[PDB]
Symmetry: C3
């Protein structure tokens, strides 16, 4: 049962596309090899979300999972998006703060586990088992946020004020936003359906656009990205 | 309806396998840590194509997608191949020219979008929607080729003549070849069926073998790969 | 027909989880940026296996493939695990020995081919074709082991005794273990069913736990991981 949410899908598609476009049109002249990296990553993010929102607006990113007492529409494309998208975001933060490869690898891996585990949960037929997965995925996330908030902040304090500041903002943004997803999941049509898929998609759209475009804007608009 | 094309699949399998074998038997003695990288990448390419051509010759890489007024055989394995294969190729070019990580990341990402988007298009049931995807994927490609042709060429001009020259050839080859794929797609059984899957596969075989083995030969046969 | 093996799945889940937990609780204080990398990789490994063993214990990682004269339960999750897990393991060995990027790339690629090819074999409907894939995958493996045993050993001889020693042990362990998998596959319910899926899973559990936790223990317990 997925059609009334089309409005947010289409609006999500537009925002992602324009957000991409805008970022593209801004990274052209950039010559700094460091600023360059930030534009690539930050541009790639909305670009991926674009293709996936579009896949949902066209019905491809929509699937049917049997559980509870019916056939439930699971928008799988979200994970296909988040799988490459979340780690890309983390990467931005990693470069910005100049984290160790080991911590970068540890996060990228914790992130893939988080989205991968989330996809399993979203497709699992045993209604009760869907929450075990949600539980594993959320632990994965709290680990990621734990590092971002405590480990990275410490690494940022050693950079110049501009970088420290932009990181702080960015950090606060992603942490507050990333944790909303599990709560949305838990109350949406994929978990304990308290909110209809209609509103679910809306919350996810606002969140997504904020976690990427909004995120990107904040970052790409700082001198923090330069050496 | 996929069986008369078996001949090109089998021939594609043989060429990929021997192409791999030959490359393997050539990288053995190589000690230069730089030449080493080029052999790995360039060897891995046909090796992947091998497994995928074989998957098509055995019926595994073949699927059925409903669209238009019938059930259409979509060789999905092509994308499974191209997904790892195209970026690997790009990587070769990146090392050769010594491109910035940011541009390397930007291309790898543009490439994954291109093949990923292509796979969606190839599996999309709404006949008309298949061209939207083709349209997104082709834009992705033109971006990649734009950088290769203009950005990379500039980066190569700063290398020694041997490297500049080999890049030029390589560049001209991949650009001319990579753009044939969308045209083939557009006229083949996955788009506006003007050419039968039978000939489609043939064009794809010639193209593939050229874009990899041919490509590999040109490169591995130059001193351009050495420091 | 997959239920009597539940016992090994559940025990596999517990061991992977605790193995992860234990490793996590050990990498906390570690400050050395090199030791850090080893903890990330080595911790991520069992963590992945955890999620996949769990997926099998809950029925999600189980699928049905038609071949021979019946419907056969294929535990696909094993490959989803091994796909990220085997290369991670290799990576540990690569860092430990400080191998060239080209050889690291060549192995990672040979490994993905090995698991990818194995997954195809495990899902291939033409009973006879399943062994062609097994044959390709095993060649892939023998290449990996060839390098580990001969190429890496040579690279390790140039490190300090502690590192050389830990590598030797590790090397001997992975080589002896990794080769058991194809033999198990060949005699298990996925190949020439001589052993029942029940015992198959047991052998795979012992193997897995050994190839990761056991492996991890040996490594993380040496000073070899420090600069
Ligand atoms: C280069 C890297 C190193 C990249 C790696 C990429 C790869 C590994 C990503 C995997 C991502 C995962 C997370 C997504 C998988 C989720 C999975 C559960 C969902 C799978 O389904 C979708 C998949 C297959 O589609 C299908 O084709 C099969 C073969 O033909 C069919 O057998 C399936 O049935 C079919 O599924 C579809 O159709 C169903 C329709 O049913 C119909 O419903 C209507 C309703 O009105 C009606 O009832 C009809 O009667 C009924 O028949 C539908 O329900 C299903 O949902 C489905 O549509 O699709 C392939 C997706 C593709 C892989 C997405 C890619 C995403 C983007 C483009 C990625 C960009 C990534 C780059 C790589 C990032 C760069 C980063 C750098 C830093 C490295
Ligand atoms: C290590 C990395 C970091 C690696 C990441 C690897 C991963 C993410 C790659 C994903 C690649 C994507 C792009 C491919 C997905 C395309 C997707 C749409 C197609 C999916 O279908 C194929 C998939 C599943 O097969 C199936 O198993 C299910 C479970 O059992 C079944 O439910 C499905 O139905 C089944 O699909 C098959 O069977 C269908 C049969 O129907 C029958 O048709 C006959 C016709 O005569 C008759 O009518 C019968 O009656 C009828 O029943 C068939 O139609 C379907 O097409 C299908 O065969 O398969 C898994 C593929 C595997 C993942 C391919 C791997 C590719 C190679 C080996 C990769 C090498 C990569 C390394 C990693 C590169 C190294 C690079 C370094 C630089 C990093
Ligand atoms: C970030 C990177 C760069 C990461 C890339 C990740 C990605 C590419 C990995 C792909 C891995 C591949 C190897 C696994 C694919 C194997 C494939 C053949 C199996 C596919 O099936 C599973 C898949 C889809 O599930 C399904 O959803 C569809 C859509 O809704 C349905 O149409 C399918 O039918 C459904 O399949 C399920 O249900 C079947 C049920 O049938 C029922 O059986 C019961 C029996 O009692 C009864 O008869 C019922 O009546 C009947 O209906 C069942 O049989 C099927 O098996 C299946 O359950 O699932 C998605 C899996 C997800 C992708 C796994 C992720 C793994 C973990 C979490 C990865 C952690 C990775 C990080 C990235 C590593 C970090 C490393 C760093 C160094 C980079
Ligand atoms: C799992 C395993 C380790 C547990 C052993 C359970 C044992 C009593 C067996 C009974 O469990 C039987 C199975 C169904 O299988 P069936 O064949 O249909 O019967 O129930 C389904 C199994 C259970 C309901 C699920 C158990 C899940 C674990 C408790 C998961 C841990 C994940 C948390 C998010 C992590 C917290 C970390 C903390 C340390 C900070
Ligand atoms: C039974 C279990 C398998 C189930 C658990 C659920 C699990 C599937 C999801 C969690 C994801 C997890 C597996 C990801 C792997 C992370 C691993 C690679 C990290 C290796 O560690 C690398 C260091 C980098 O060091 P730094 O630069 O000084 O910072 O991590 C950062 C160092 C930090 C400064 C210190 C961090 C300390 C930890 C937060 C505490 C250890 C965790 C606890 C024992 C319990 C788990 C909590 C849960 C929220 C992760
Ligand atoms: C998408 C969105 C941005 C467009 C809003 C469309 C709006 C009028 C809604 C009607 O669109 C309704 C949907 C079907 O959904 P349904 O629920 O079945 O009804 O049609 C299907 C939707 C449309 C037919 C597809 C629109 C696609 C966009 C125009 C795609 C852009 C991709 C190009 C390749 C990029 C060119 C780049 C340039 C800037 C250089
Ligand atoms: C609505 C949209 C979402 C739909 C578009 C379709 C889209 C899905 C497919 C395109 C793929 C694209 C998303 C890939 C992301 C690329 C991005 C990461 C690049 C960031 O940029 C990194 C720099 C590296 O700099 P260098 O070393 O000096 O060279 O790129 C190279 C710098 C170059 C020297 C300058 C390049 C300039 C551009 C070619 C012009 C900008 C593009 C245009 C506004 C329109 C799009 C054209 C289409 C062909 C890409
Ligand atoms: C028809 C074929 C397509 C079918 C074959 C099955 C195939 C699909 C599976 C094999 C996986 C293979 C494709 C993986 C690609 C590897 C490739 C990228 C390697 C490039 O090479 C990089 C170097 C790194 O050099 P170093 O640091 O001095 O060590 O490899 C290491 C250098 C070593 C020191 C020297 C190694 C020599 C080789 C072992 C001998 C060459 C192989 C033989 C001709 C036959 C194949 C044997 C099979 C067991 C691989
Ligand atoms: C652009 C998208 C962003 C920043 C997405 C972030 C997504 C998450 C933090 C998702 C988390 C989830 C859980 C913690 C558990 C349940 C399922 C998920 C995948 C929704
Ligand atoms: C070895 C294989 C090579 C070099 C493959 C290259 C493939 C492409 C450039 C494919 C491009 C496509 C489009 C631009 C749109 C439609 C679908 C594709 C995936 C065929
Ligand atoms: C933690 C898991 C480990 C170390 C797994 C190793 C797995 C292999 C070496 C698997 C090899 C296989 C073949 C060589 C051919 C047949 C199928 C496989 C995938 C089981």
């Amino acid at each position: 049962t997925g059609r009334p949410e089309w409005i947010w899908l289409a609006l999500g598609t537009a925002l992602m596309g324009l957000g991409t476009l805008y970022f593209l049109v801004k990274g052209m002249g950039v010559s700094d090899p460091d600023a360059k990296k930030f534009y690539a990553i930050t541009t790639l993010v909305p670009a991926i979300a674009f293709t996936m929102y579009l896949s949902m607006l066209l019905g491809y990113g929509l699937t049917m999972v049997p559980f509870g007492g019916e056939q439930n529409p699971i928008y799988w494309a979200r994970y296909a998006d988040w799988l490459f998208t979340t780690p890309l975001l983390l990467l931005d933060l990693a470069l910005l703060v100049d984290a160790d490869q080991g911590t970068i690898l540890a996060l990228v891996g914790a992130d893939g586990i988080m989205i991968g585990t989330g996809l399993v949960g979203a497709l699992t037929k045993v209604y009760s088992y869907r929450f075990v997965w949600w539980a594993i995925s959320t632990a994965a996330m709290l680990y990621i946020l734990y590092v971002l908030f405590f480990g990275f902040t410490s690494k940022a304090e050693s950079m110049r004020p501009e970088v420290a500041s932009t990181f702080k903002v960015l950090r606060n943004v992603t942490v507050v936003l990333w944790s909303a997803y599990p709560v949305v999941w838990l109350i949406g049509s994929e978990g304990a359906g308290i909110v209809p898929l209609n509103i679910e998609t809306l919350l996810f759209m606002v969140l997504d656009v904020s976690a990427k475009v909004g995120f990107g804007l904040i970052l790409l608009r700082s001198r923090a990205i330069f050496g």
